[PDB]
Amino acid sequence: ARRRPIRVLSLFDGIATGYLVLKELGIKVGKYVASENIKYVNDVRNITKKNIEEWGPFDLVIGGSPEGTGRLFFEFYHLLNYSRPKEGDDRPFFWMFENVVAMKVGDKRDISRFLECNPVMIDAARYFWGNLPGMSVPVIRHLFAPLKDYF
Amino acid sequence: QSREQMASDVANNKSSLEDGCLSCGRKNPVSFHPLFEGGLCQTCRDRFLELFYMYDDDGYQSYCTVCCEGRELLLCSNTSCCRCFCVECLEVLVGTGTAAEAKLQEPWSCYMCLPQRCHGVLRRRKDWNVRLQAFFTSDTGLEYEAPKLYPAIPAARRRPIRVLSLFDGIATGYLVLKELGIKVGKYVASEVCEESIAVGTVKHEGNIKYVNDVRNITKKNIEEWGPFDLVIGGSPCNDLSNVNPARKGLYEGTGRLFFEFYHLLNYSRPKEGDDRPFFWMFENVVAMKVGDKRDISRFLECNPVMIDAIKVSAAHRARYFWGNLPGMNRPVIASKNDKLELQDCLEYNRIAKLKKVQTITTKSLFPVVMNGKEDVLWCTELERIFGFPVHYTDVSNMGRGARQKLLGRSWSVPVIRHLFAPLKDYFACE
Amino acid sequence: DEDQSREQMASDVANNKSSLEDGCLSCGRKNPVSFHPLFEGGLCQTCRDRFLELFYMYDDDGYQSYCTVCCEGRELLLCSNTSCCRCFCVECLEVLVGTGTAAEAKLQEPWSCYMCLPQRCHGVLRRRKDWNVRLQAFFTSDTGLEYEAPKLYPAIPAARRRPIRVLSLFDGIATGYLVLKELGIKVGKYVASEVCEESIAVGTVKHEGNIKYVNDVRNITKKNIEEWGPFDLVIGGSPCNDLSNVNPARKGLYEGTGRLFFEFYHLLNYSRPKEGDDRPFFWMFENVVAMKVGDKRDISRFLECNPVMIDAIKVSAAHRARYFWGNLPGMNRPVIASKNDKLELQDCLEYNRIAKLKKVQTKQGKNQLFPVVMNGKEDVLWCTELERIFGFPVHYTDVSNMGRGARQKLLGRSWSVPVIRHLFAPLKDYFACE
Ligand SMILES: Nc1ncnc2c1ncn2[C@@H]1O[C@H](CSCC[C@H](N)C(=O)O)[C@@H](O)[C@H]1O
Ligand SMILES: Nc1ncnc2c1ncn2[C@@H]1O[C@H](CSCC[C@H](N)C(=O)O)[C@@H](O)[C@H]1O
Ligand SMILES: [Zn+2]
Ligand SMILES: [Zn+2]
Ligand SMILES: [Zn+2]
Ligand SMILES: [Zn+2]
Ligand SMILES: [Zn+2]
Ligand SMILES: [Zn+2]
């Protein structure tokens, strides 16, 4: 109990649907930093370590790619390492990635190896990831429905 | 805003060339030529950052020395000079009528082969030799912090350097370490080529623990192989280099293996609260695109240095050397035992037609004549140029096809010996 | 008595009605002019004249091309054991041992030759207890005429010695020069007649051009020798390409490369001195053992010498026997291995490499592909190992940026350092040393 509100470092807002579903979920946000209420920061190429140190911490990361996938994914990973908690910390942490199943198999092997986590698949299908307790807007609502347990 | 009126304006003894783009014409410049006096626009200096160190298959410079472009290029035929000029560049600056002058003047001498003055407006710099290297080393992207100075660990407490290596090749890193005298208490490798393992095993008495491919090393392997004290690494320089029209960038192709150096760099680097030294190293070809010189140094969070082998060897080798080695930005001093000239590496009763050999690719003019007969270089002479011991690749029945390809993607021994010199302040030598 | 089947003689020796030395061991004919060097028996005129030629013939995969007894290729049966390659044919096995044994022997897997097996009277094929010492003498004496023993030159005074003015006709890769330099004999001049441009590079870069070259041998006249003379030693060796019986379209002497023998003879006649002399003079020659006996007779008649036979396997780790003519002091001493001889294949390999055989013979798949095994994958010999096998100092042929085939071909047709060292050892007694 006694849970502070959420702060999500989203990415690839696009239509900014994720914020809409999060608001409809019945929980409030503390600070949202999006990049294509939403406090825009920069382009994807202009975020430094001291920036995340100053505005940290964070509790959510979002992927998304409906072209070179590595261009976006490796910056995503870069940040993901930036936002992840250091040693001696017990703060809850989340992450999540979205990618179409129509993709290279070697690509898939590489991303699975780099994220050090086995992937999951949800039919429409879209390749899915994420260290989150739980097992297309309806898909978004279904996925972040159980987010209210620890918040 | 053509260069025609710009040259006339500065010819009136009332204006300078640094207010405009010498190779581009437009005003609003950012920086200057390191070869002459003037300035360039922002989008026009980027192309000079890449193409300066290119060379053609004919042993001569690839593109223009003024504008770095040309449909046709007049070529200088002096002694070991490769600069090729542009057709329209000459008449804009030095004066009109030079098209038919150099055509009939055989041999032609370019403006860096003769004592030059303000011929037209071609004011060659008095000390362009020293200011050219600063055009490639000291740029300003984000001004990262100075390298952390690990405390100088004295003797009687230094462990043998537990080296790690990715894409080892022919154990170039191991060879230099034994030359310095640093005891290699453990040396993992990451080579996959069949012939490369043969060279590193028989020559080194089986002291190298060749293990496996890079894409199979998992998180658990490092803690059962470590702790490590250095992480060497050299990426495959064929993904995005300005020689293959494929143009497979860092984010698409075998350039993906750069992050695999960064990936394994995170596991090996010490956890928070520990106070032990941990050095690392990286290098790639200088002739890469614009959007990679800083991205690789952004993820690494460091400032690249540049070292050229022409000051310590008889070949043209200059690459970007990342890392935080102790005292790495110091100037490139030559060695007394260096084979500074080609004639110190040739066989008996052979003489050369050049002084410094230009770059060599998968396909090897002819730089040697013996007994008054025209010949080419031998595979046992390339080893002396790169500082390797003689009869080093004579293993596993390779002729000239493999002893040349395998030697064309290795590091210069006296160049690497420069960086690793201060490592004796942290590890037990001899 | 002569043209009958082998059954009569087999029964006669079975019924104690005759002796082993009465009939030919390979055809049954009478008149034992010689003795079989491996068993008890006799040879006729038309049998031993094809046993001096085809005994040292080997196949392309390291085996014997003809059976050990009849030397006729009708049907073969190979000794499966390694370190031995001698094989017996069908008729040579069935008649002289026992009927019905061929099928059982073929079904007997693995099979062993009777020489590998312990000696017993398996039929009438009794094995001589001193076969080797008699086989060695089978190839050197009892043939041809009895030429007068060469006269030894008088003992040269120790002080009055001069550097040797060699003329190494058909030098190759300066094998004789390498032996002389290693032996410790002062060379004051060294001529050479080679037309192999790659070999010129090897002889030039390695020995600092100390040897004065000459172009093709076919363009040398008397005046050249008059200018270059005197000559304290003449050396030569014919290219054993067309002389050997390996090629079906063999020409032998008097044709092709055989004619070069006449060039060597003329060059030796020109360079040898005149009457009323005291200058020491020595010469030498070499050709393969496997050649026609008639050509060997003509060569031995022209030169007036009885050739000796030296087999490299007694000091080296290879199969190589070749004839030696010449005049040197003591060409038929018993050979002894040196204290630094690489006698077995194990001493001529790389690191992390293991040798399975012990002495290598001179379709390259699954049979010759397995001389050396590394990490469970058997492979072939390297050039750096051939250089060690042949006795040359290591890293010798690696010039002119040539790879595997050129190096091995250039290495396969040369001499061996220990054999020529043994031959040239007594030469320190006439010329200046060190
Ligand atoms: N996936 C992979 N795993 C291990 N090695 C690889 C590899 N992909 C390429 N390599 C090898 O890595 C080498 C990089 S070239 C670098 C040579 C070496 N680092 C030196 O400077 O001496 C290439 O020759 C290639 O054969
Ligand atoms: N027509 C010719 N004239 C002169 N030399 C010849 C020749 N044909 C072949 N040769 C040389 O004769 C040599 C035969 S190899 C035999 C030479 C010596 N036993 C050694 O190898 O050390 C070859 O090296 C070849 O270069
Ligand atoms: Zn410009
Ligand atoms: Zn130009
Ligand atoms: Zn020039
Ligand atoms: Zn007979
Ligand atoms: Zn037979
Ligand atoms: Zn046998």
CSV table of N, CA, C and O in Angstrom, one decimal, chain B residues 254-343:
chain,number,residue,atom,x,y,z
B,254,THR,N,27.4,-6.2,-40.3
B,254,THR,CA,28.3,-6.7,-39.3
B,254,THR,C,28.8,-5.6,-38.4
B,254,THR,O,29.7,-5.9,-37.6
B,255,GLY,N,28.4,-4.4,-38.7
B,255,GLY,CA,28.8,-3.3,-37.7
B,255,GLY,C,28.0,-3.5,-36.4
B,255,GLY,O,28.4,-2.9,-35.4
B,256,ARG,N,27.0,-4.4,-36.4
B,256,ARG,CA,26.3,-4.7,-35.2
B,256,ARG,C,27.2,-5.3,-34.1
B,256,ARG,O,26.9,-5.2,-32.9
B,257,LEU,N,28.3,-5.8,-34.5
B,257,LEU,CA,29.2,-6.4,-33.6
B,257,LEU,C,30.0,-5.4,-32.8
B,257,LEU,O,30.7,-5.8,-31.8
B,258,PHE,N,29.9,-4.1,-33.0
B,258,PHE,CA,30.4,-3.1,-32.2
B,258,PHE,C,29.8,-3.1,-30.8
B,258,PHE,O,30.4,-3.1,-29.8
B,259,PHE,N,28.4,-3.1,-30.8
B,259,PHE,CA,27.7,-3.2,-29.5
B,259,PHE,C,28.1,-4.4,-28.7
B,259,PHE,O,28.0,-4.4,-27.5
B,260,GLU,N,28.4,-5.5,-29.4
B,260,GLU,CA,28.8,-6.7,-28.7
B,260,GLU,C,30.2,-6.5,-28.0
B,260,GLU,O,30.4,-7.2,-27.0
B,261,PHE,N,31.0,-5.6,-28.4
B,261,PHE,CA,32.1,-5.1,-27.6
B,261,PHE,C,31.6,-4.3,-26.4
B,261,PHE,O,32.0,-4.5,-25.3
B,262,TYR,N,30.6,-3.4,-26.6
B,262,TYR,CA,30.0,-2.7,-25.5
B,262,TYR,C,29.2,-3.6,-24.6
B,262,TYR,O,29.2,-3.4,-23.4
B,263,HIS,N,28.6,-4.6,-25.1
B,263,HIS,CA,27.8,-5.5,-24.3
B,263,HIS,C,28.7,-6.3,-23.3
B,263,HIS,O,28.4,-6.3,-22.1
B,264,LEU,N,29.8,-6.9,-23.8
B,264,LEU,CA,30.7,-7.6,-23.0
B,264,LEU,C,31.5,-6.6,-22.2
B,264,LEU,O,32.2,-7.1,-21.2
B,265,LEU,N,31.6,-5.3,-22.5
B,265,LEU,CA,32.3,-4.4,-21.7
B,265,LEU,C,31.6,-4.1,-20.4
B,265,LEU,O,32.3,-3.8,-19.4
B,266,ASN,N,30.3,-4.2,-20.4
B,266,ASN,CA,29.5,-3.9,-19.2
B,266,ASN,C,29.7,-5.0,-18.1
B,266,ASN,O,29.8,-4.7,-16.9
B,267,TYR,N,29.7,-6.3,-18.5
B,267,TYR,CA,29.9,-7.4,-17.6
B,267,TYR,C,31.3,-7.3,-17.0
B,267,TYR,O,31.4,-7.6,-15.8
B,268,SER,N,32.3,-7.1,-17.8
B,268,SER,CA,33.7,-7.1,-17.3
B,268,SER,C,34.1,-6.0,-16.5
B,268,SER,O,34.9,-6.1,-15.6
B,269,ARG,N,33.5,-4.8,-16.7
B,269,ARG,CA,33.9,-3.6,-15.9
B,269,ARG,C,33.4,-3.8,-14.4
B,269,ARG,O,32.4,-4.4,-14.2
B,270,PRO,N,34.3,-3.3,-13.5
B,270,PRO,CA,34.0,-3.7,-12.1
B,270,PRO,C,32.7,-3.1,-11.6
B,270,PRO,O,32.2,-2.0,-12.0
B,271,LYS,N,32.1,-3.8,-10.6
B,271,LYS,CA,30.9,-3.3,-10.0
B,271,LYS,C,31.1,-2.1,-9.1
B,271,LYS,O,32.3,-1.8,-8.8
B,272,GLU,N,30.1,-1.4,-8.8
B,272,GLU,CA,30.2,-0.2,-8.0
B,272,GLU,C,30.7,-0.5,-6.6
B,272,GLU,O,30.4,-1.5,-6.0
B,273,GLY,N,31.7,0.4,-6.1
B,273,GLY,CA,32.3,0.2,-4.9
B,273,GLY,C,33.7,-0.4,-4.9
B,273,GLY,O,34.4,-0.3,-3.9
B,274,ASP,N,34.1,-1.0,-6.0
B,274,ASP,CA,35.4,-1.6,-6.2
B,274,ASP,C,36.4,-0.6,-6.7
B,274,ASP,O,36.0,0.3,-7.5
B,275,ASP,N,37.6,-0.8,-6.4
B,275,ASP,CA,38.6,0.2,-6.7
B,275,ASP,C,39.8,-0.4,-7.5
B,275,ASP,O,41.0,-0.2,-7.1
B,276,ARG,N,39.6,-1.3,-8.5
B,276,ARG,CA,40.6,-1.9,-9.2
B,276,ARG,C,40.7,-1.3,-10.6
B,276,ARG,O,39.7,-0.9,-11.2
B,277,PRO,N,41.9,-1.2,-11.2
B,277,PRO,CA,42.0,-0.6,-12.5
B,277,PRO,C,41.3,-1.5,-13.6
B,277,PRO,O,41.3,-2.7,-13.4
B,278,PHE,N,40.8,-0.9,-14.6
B,278,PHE,CA,40.2,-1.6,-15.7
B,278,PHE,C,40.3,-0.7,-17.0
B,278,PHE,O,39.6,0.3,-17.1
B,279,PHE,N,41.2,-1.1,-17.9
B,279,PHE,CA,41.4,-0.4,-19.1
B,279,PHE,C,40.7,-1.2,-20.3
B,279,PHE,O,40.4,-2.3,-20.2
B,280,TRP,N,40.5,-0.4,-21.4
B,280,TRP,CA,39.9,-1.0,-22.6
B,280,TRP,C,40.4,-0.2,-23.8
B,280,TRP,O,41.2,0.7,-23.7
B,281,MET,N,39.9,-0.6,-24.9
B,281,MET,CA,40.5,-0.2,-26.2
B,281,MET,C,39.6,-0.6,-27.3
B,281,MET,O,38.9,-1.5,-27.3
B,282,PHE,N,39.6,0.3,-28.4
B,282,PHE,CA,38.9,0.1,-29.6
B,282,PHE,C,39.5,0.8,-30.7
B,282,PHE,O,40.3,1.8,-30.5
B,283,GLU,N,39.2,0.4,-32.0
B,283,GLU,CA,39.8,1.0,-33.1
B,283,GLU,C,39.0,0.6,-34.4
B,283,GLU,O,38.4,-0.5,-34.4
B,284,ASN,N,39.0,1.5,-35.3
B,284,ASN,CA,38.3,1.3,-36.6
B,284,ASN,C,38.9,2.2,-37.7
B,284,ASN,O,39.7,3.0,-37.4
B,285,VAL,N,38.5,1.9,-38.9
B,285,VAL,CA,39.1,2.7,-40.0
B,285,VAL,C,38.6,4.1,-39.9
B,285,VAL,O,37.5,4.4,-39.6
B,286,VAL,N,39.5,5.1,-40.3
B,286,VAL,CA,39.2,6.5,-40.2
B,286,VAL,C,38.2,6.9,-41.4
B,286,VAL,O,37.4,7.8,-41.2
B,287,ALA,N,38.2,6.1,-42.5
B,287,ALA,CA,37.4,6.4,-43.6
B,287,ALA,C,35.9,5.9,-43.5
B,287,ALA,O,35.4,5.2,-44.3
B,288,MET,N,35.3,6.3,-42.4
B,288,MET,CA,33.9,6.0,-42.2
B,288,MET,C,33.0,7.2,-42.3
B,288,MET,O,33.5,8.3,-42.4
B,289,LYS,N,31.7,7.0,-42.4
B,289,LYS,CA,30.7,8.0,-42.6
B,289,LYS,C,30.7,9.1,-41.5
B,289,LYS,O,31.4,8.9,-40.5
B,290,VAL,N,29.9,10.1,-41.7
B,290,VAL,CA,29.8,11.2,-40.7
B,290,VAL,C,29.1,10.7,-39.5
B,290,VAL,O,29.5,11.0,-38.4
B,291,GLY,N,28.0,9.9,-39.7
B,291,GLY,CA,27.1,9.6,-38.5
B,291,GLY,C,27.6,8.5,-37.7
B,291,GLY,O,26.9,7.9,-36.9
B,292,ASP,N,28.9,8.1,-37.8
B,292,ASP,CA,29.5,7.0,-37.0
B,292,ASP,C,30.7,7.5,-36.2
B,292,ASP,O,31.0,6.8,-35.2
B,293,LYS,N,31.3,8.6,-36.6
B,293,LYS,CA,32.5,9.0,-35.8
B,293,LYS,C,32.1,9.4,-34.4
B,293,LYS,O,32.9,9.3,-33.5
B,294,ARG,N,30.9,9.9,-34.2
B,294,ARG,CA,30.5,10.4,-32.8
B,294,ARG,C,29.5,9.4,-32.1
B,294,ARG,O,29.6,9.3,-30.9
B,295,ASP,N,28.7,8.6,-32.9
B,295,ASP,CA,27.9,7.6,-32.3
B,295,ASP,C,28.7,6.6,-31.6
B,295,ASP,O,28.3,6.2,-30.4
B,296,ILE,N,29.7,6.1,-32.2
B,296,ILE,CA,30.6,5.1,-31.5
B,296,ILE,C,31.3,5.7,-30.3
B,296,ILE,O,31.5,5.0,-29.3
B,297,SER,N,31.6,7.0,-30.4
B,297,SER,CA,32.2,7.7,-29.2
B,297,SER,C,31.1,8.3,-28.2
B,297,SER,O,31.5,8.7,-27.2
B,298,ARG,N,29.8,8.2,-28.6
B,298,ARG,CA,28.8,8.6,-27.7
B,298,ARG,C,28.4,7.4,-26.8
B,298,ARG,O,28.4,7.5,-25.5
B,299,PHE,N,28.2,6.2,-27.3
B,299,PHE,CA,28.0,5.0,-26.6
B,299,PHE,C,29.2,4.7,-25.6
B,299,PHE,O,29.0,4.4,-24.5
B,300,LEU,N,30.4,4.9,-26.2
B,300,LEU,CA,31.6,4.7,-25.4
B,300,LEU,C,31.9,5.9,-24.5
B,300,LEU,O,32.6,5.7,-23.5
B,301,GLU,N,31.3,7.0,-24.8
B,301,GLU,CA,31.6,8.2,-24.0
B,301,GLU,C,33.0,8.6,-23.8
B,301,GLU,O,33.6,8.7,-22.7
B,302,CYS,N,33.7,8.7,-25.0
B,302,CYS,CA,35.1,9.0,-25.0
B,302,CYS,C,35.4,9.9,-26.3
B,302,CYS,O,34.6,10.0,-27.2
B,303,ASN,N,36.7,10.4,-26.3
B,303,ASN,CA,37.1,11.2,-27.4
B,303,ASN,C,38.2,10.5,-28.2
B,303,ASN,O,39.3,10.1,-27.6
B,304,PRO,N,38.0,10.1,-29.5
B,304,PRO,CA,39.0,9.4,-30.2
B,304,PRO,C,40.3,10.1,-30.4
B,304,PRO,O,40.3,11.4,-30.5
B,305,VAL,N,41.4,9.4,-30.5
B,305,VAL,CA,42.7,9.9,-30.9
B,305,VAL,C,43.1,9.4,-32.3
B,305,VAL,O,42.4,8.5,-32.8
B,306,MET,N,44.1,10.0,-32.8
B,306,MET,CA,44.6,9.5,-34.2
B,306,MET,C,46.1,9.4,-34.1
B,306,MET,O,46.8,10.3,-33.7
B,307,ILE,N,46.6,8.2,-34.6
B,307,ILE,CA,48.0,7.9,-34.7
B,307,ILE,C,48.3,7.4,-36.1
B,307,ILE,O,47.6,6.4,-36.5
B,308,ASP,N,49.3,7.9,-36.8
B,308,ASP,CA,49.6,7.5,-38.1
B,308,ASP,C,50.9,6.7,-38.1
B,308,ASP,O,51.9,7.1,-37.4
B,309,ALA,N,51.0,5.6,-38.8
B,309,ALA,CA,52.2,4.8,-38.9
B,309,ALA,C,53.3,5.3,-39.8
B,309,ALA,O,54.4,4.7,-39.8
B,310,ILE,N,53.0,6.3,-40.6
B,310,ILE,CA,54.0,6.9,-41.5
B,310,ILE,C,55.1,7.5,-40.7
B,310,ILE,O,56.2,7.7,-41.3
B,311,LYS,N,54.9,7.9,-39.5
B,311,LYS,CA,55.9,8.4,-38.6
B,311,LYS,C,56.7,7.4,-37.9
B,311,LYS,O,57.8,7.7,-37.3
B,312,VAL,N,56.3,6.1,-38.0
B,312,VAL,CA,57.1,5.0,-37.3
B,312,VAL,C,57.3,3.8,-38.2
B,312,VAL,O,58.0,2.9,-37.8
B,313,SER,N,56.8,3.8,-39.4
B,313,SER,CA,57.0,2.7,-40.3
B,313,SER,C,57.1,3.2,-41.7
B,313,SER,O,57.4,4.4,-41.9
B,314,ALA,N,57.1,2.4,-42.7
B,314,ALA,CA,57.2,2.7,-44.1
B,314,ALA,C,55.9,2.6,-44.9
B,314,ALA,O,56.0,2.5,-46.1
B,315,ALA,N,54.8,2.5,-44.2
B,315,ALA,CA,53.5,2.3,-44.8
B,315,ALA,C,52.5,3.4,-44.3
B,315,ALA,O,52.9,4.2,-43.5
B,316,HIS,N,51.3,3.4,-44.9
B,316,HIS,CA,50.3,4.4,-44.6
B,316,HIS,C,49.2,3.8,-43.8
B,316,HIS,O,48.3,3.1,-44.3
B,317,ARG,N,49.3,3.9,-42.5
B,317,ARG,CA,48.3,3.3,-41.6
B,317,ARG,C,48.0,4.3,-40.5
B,317,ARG,O,48.8,4.7,-39.6
B,318,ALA,N,46.7,4.8,-40.5
B,318,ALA,CA,46.3,5.8,-39.5
B,318,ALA,C,44.8,5.4,-39.2
B,318,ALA,O,43.9,5.5,-40.1
B,319,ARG,N,44.6,5.1,-37.9
B,319,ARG,CA,43.2,4.7,-37.5
B,319,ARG,C,42.8,5.4,-36.2
B,319,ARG,O,43.7,6.1,-35.6
B,320,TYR,N,41.6,5.3,-35.9
B,320,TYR,CA,41.0,6.0,-34.7
B,320,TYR,C,41.2,5.0,-33.5
B,320,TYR,O,40.7,3.9,-33.6
B,321,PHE,N,41.8,5.5,-32.4
B,321,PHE,CA,42.2,4.6,-31.3
B,321,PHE,C,41.4,5.1,-30.1
B,321,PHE,O,41.9,6.0,-29.4
B,322,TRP,N,40.3,4.5,-29.8
B,322,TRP,CA,39.5,4.8,-28.6
B,322,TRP,C,40.2,4.3,-27.4
B,322,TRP,O,41.2,3.6,-27.4
B,323,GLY,N,39.5,4.5,-26.2
B,323,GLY,CA,40.0,3.9,-25.0
B,323,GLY,C,40.4,5.0,-24.0
B,323,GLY,O,40.3,6.2,-24.3
B,324,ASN,N,40.8,4.6,-22.8
B,324,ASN,CA,41.3,5.5,-21.8
B,324,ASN,C,42.6,4.9,-21.2
B,324,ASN,O,42.9,4.9,-20.0
B,325,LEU,N,43.5,4.6,-22.1
B,325,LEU,CA,44.9,4.2,-21.7
B,325,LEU,C,45.6,5.3,-21.1
B,325,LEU,O,45.3,6.5,-21.4
B,326,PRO,N,46.5,5.1,-20.2
B,326,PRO,CA,47.2,6.1,-19.4
B,326,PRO,C,48.2,6.9,-20.4
B,326,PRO,O,49.2,6.3,-20.8
B,327,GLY,N,48.0,8.2,-20.6
B,327,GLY,CA,48.8,8.9,-21.5
B,327,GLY,C,48.8,8.5,-22.9
B,327,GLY,O,49.8,8.0,-23.4
B,328,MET,N,47.6,8.6,-23.5
B,328,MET,CA,47.4,8.1,-24.9
B,328,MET,C,47.4,9.2,-25.9
B,328,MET,O,47.7,9.0,-27.1
B,329,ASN,N,47.1,10.5,-25.5
B,329,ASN,CA,47.1,11.6,-26.4
B,329,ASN,C,48.4,12.2,-26.7
B,329,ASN,O,48.5,13.2,-27.4
B,330,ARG,N,49.5,11.6,-26.1
B,330,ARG,CA,50.8,12.2,-26.3
B,330,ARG,C,51.3,12.0,-27.8
B,330,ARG,O,50.8,11.2,-28.5
B,331,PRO,N,52.2,12.9,-28.2
B,331,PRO,CA,52.6,12.8,-29.6
B,331,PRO,C,53.3,11.5,-30.0
B,331,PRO,O,53.9,10.8,-29.2
B,332,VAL,N,53.3,11.3,-31.3
B,332,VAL,CA,53.8,10.0,-31.9
B,332,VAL,C,55.3,10.1,-32.0
B,332,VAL,O,55.8,10.6,-33.1
B,333,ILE,N,56.1,9.6,-31.1
B,333,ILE,CA,57.5,9.6,-31.2
B,333,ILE,C,57.9,8.3,-32.0
B,333,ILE,O,57.4,7.3,-31.8
B,334,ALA,N,58.9,8.5,-32.8
B,334,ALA,CA,59.5,7.4,-33.6
B,334,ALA,C,60.5,6.6,-32.7
B,334,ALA,O,61.0,7.1,-31.7
B,335,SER,N,60.9,5.4,-33.2
B,335,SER,CA,61.8,4.6,-32.5
B,335,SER,C,63.1,4.5,-33.3
B,335,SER,O,63.2,4.6,-34.5
B,336,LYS,N,64.2,4.3,-32.5
B,336,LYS,CA,65.5,4.1,-33.1
B,336,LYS,C,65.7,2.9,-33.9
B,336,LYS,O,66.4,2.9,-34.9
B,337,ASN,N,65.0,1.8,-33.5
B,337,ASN,CA,65.1,0.5,-34.3
B,337,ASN,C,64.0,0.4,-35.4
B,337,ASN,O,63.9,-0.6,-36.0
B,338,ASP,N,63.2,1.5,-35.6
B,338,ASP,CA,62.2,1.4,-36.6
B,338,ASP,C,62.8,1.4,-38.0
B,338,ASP,O,63.9,1.9,-38.3
B,339,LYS,N,62.1,0.6,-38.9
B,339,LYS,CA,62.5,0.5,-40.3
B,339,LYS,C,61.8,1.7,-41.0
B,339,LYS,O,60.9,1.5,-41.7
B,340,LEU,N,62.4,2.9,-40.8
B,340,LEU,CA,61.7,4.1,-41.2
B,340,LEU,C,61.7,4.3,-42.8
B,340,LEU,O,60.9,5.1,-43.3
B,341,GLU,N,62.5,3.5,-43.5
B,341,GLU,CA,62.5,3.6,-44.9
B,341,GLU,C,62.4,2.2,-45.6
B,341,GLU,O,62.7,1.2,-45.0
B,342,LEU,N,61.9,2.2,-46.8
B,342,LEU,CA,61.6,0.9,-47.5
B,342,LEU,C,62.9,0.1,-47.7
B,342,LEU,O,62.9,-1.1,-47.6
B,343,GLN,N,64.0,0.8,-48.0
B,343,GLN,CA,65.3,0.1,-48.3
B,343,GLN,C,65.8,-0.6,-47.1
B,343,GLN,O,66.9,-1.3,-47.3
